[PDB]
Amino acid sequence: AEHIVEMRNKDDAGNTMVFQPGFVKVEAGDTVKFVPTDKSHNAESVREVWPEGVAPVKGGFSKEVVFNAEKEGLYVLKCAPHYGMGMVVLVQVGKPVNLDQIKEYKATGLAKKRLDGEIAKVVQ
Numbered sequence: 001a002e003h004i005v006e007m008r009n010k011d012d013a014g015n016t017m018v019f020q021p022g023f024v025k026v027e028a029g030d031t032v033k034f035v036p037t038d039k040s041h042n043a044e045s046v047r048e049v050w051p052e053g054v055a056p057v058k059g060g061f062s063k064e065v066v067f068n069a070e071k072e073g074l075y076v077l078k079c080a081p082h083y084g085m086g087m088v089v090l091v092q093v094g095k096p097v098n099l100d101q102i103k104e105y106k107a108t109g110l111a112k113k114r115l116d117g118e119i120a121k122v123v124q
């Protein structure tokens, strides 16, 4: 099953530099497509927290990119120019096996706020 995450300058609630949705639950074999609804964004792995051994994602600037969900766990992506403004997304593939490690990751500021909100949506 395919899931879409839009790259947006603003959502309708007023939040700026957002992935919409900011949390998505998927199953192995699903794809997650990050689409440039607004230009000047990307989606790429936060490599410092990306699951061990799983191929990273690095989309081009203003381009669509896919995450091929395969191994169970939690996957954090950022928008490179807007990470500090909070533009972060959390994809859960199946069981959230690495939840402790995602909670241990030190984000700050707006990424911390937004990632914490996303972590709270994890399905256990």
Ligand SMILES: [Cu+2]
Pocket: 007, 017, 040, 041, 042, 079, 080, 081, 082, 087
């Ligand atoms: Cu962005």
